[PDB]
Amino acid sequence: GSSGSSGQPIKQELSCKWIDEAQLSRPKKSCDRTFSTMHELVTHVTMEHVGGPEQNNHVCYWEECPREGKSFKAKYKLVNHIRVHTGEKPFPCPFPGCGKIFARSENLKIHKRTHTGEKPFKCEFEGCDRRFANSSDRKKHMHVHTSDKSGPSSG
Numbered sequence: 001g002s003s004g005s006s007g008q009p010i011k012q013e014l015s016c017k018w019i020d021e022a023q024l025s026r027p028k029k030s031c032d033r034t035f036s037t038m039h040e041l042v043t044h045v046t047m048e049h050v051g052g053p054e055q056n057n058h059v060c061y062w063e064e065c066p067r068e069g070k071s072f073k074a075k076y077k078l079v080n081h082i083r084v085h086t087g088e089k090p091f092p093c094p095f096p097g098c099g100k101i102f103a104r105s106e107n108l109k110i111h112k113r114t115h116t117g118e119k120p121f122k123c124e125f126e127g128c129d130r131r132f133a134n135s136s137d138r139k140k141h142m143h144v145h146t147s148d149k150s151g152p153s154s155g
């Protein structure tokens, strides 16, 4: 194998929500941890979770696993399953009521135009012209509104 790997890739954070049903501590707790790379999350979620090739009955209990904690007929079967628990992406969708995510930059940029011309979150400040997708940004654009400007009438 070989690749250009020009420059540095994208730094994405991962999380393995492991909710043990046999846990005697409530409310049900999840596996608190993080990783800088996928591989690191694999060796863990697999060994640090599903265990190694030594464990016979291996079962992955996800905070909301689609399997509901079911056993497989092979190791590769389980290890391959957790593959869905990763779902690593470069950048989500700038739309709130979309929660959509893509693995391509052109896909998102092209999919963002298929949403609408105007933004959902518009500056609440009257006589102001802005655009936002998250109530956070807007509320952050107010830090500059606290004050006013006296000069150009038509603004």
Ligand SMILES: [Zn+2]
Residues within 6 Å of the ligand: 016, 017, 018, 031, 032, 033, 044, 045, 048, 049
């Ligand atoms: Zn974990």
Ligand SMILES: [Zn+2]
Residues within 6 Å of the ligand: 060, 061, 062, 065, 066, 067, 081, 082, 085
């Ligand atoms: Zn699972």
Ligand SMILES: [Zn+2]
Residues within 6 Å of the ligand: 093, 094, 095, 098, 099, 100, 111, 112, 115
């Ligand atoms: Zn979208």
Ligand SMILES: [Zn+2]
Residues within 6 Å of the ligand: 123, 124, 125, 128, 129, 130, 141, 145
């Ligand atoms: Zn404004």
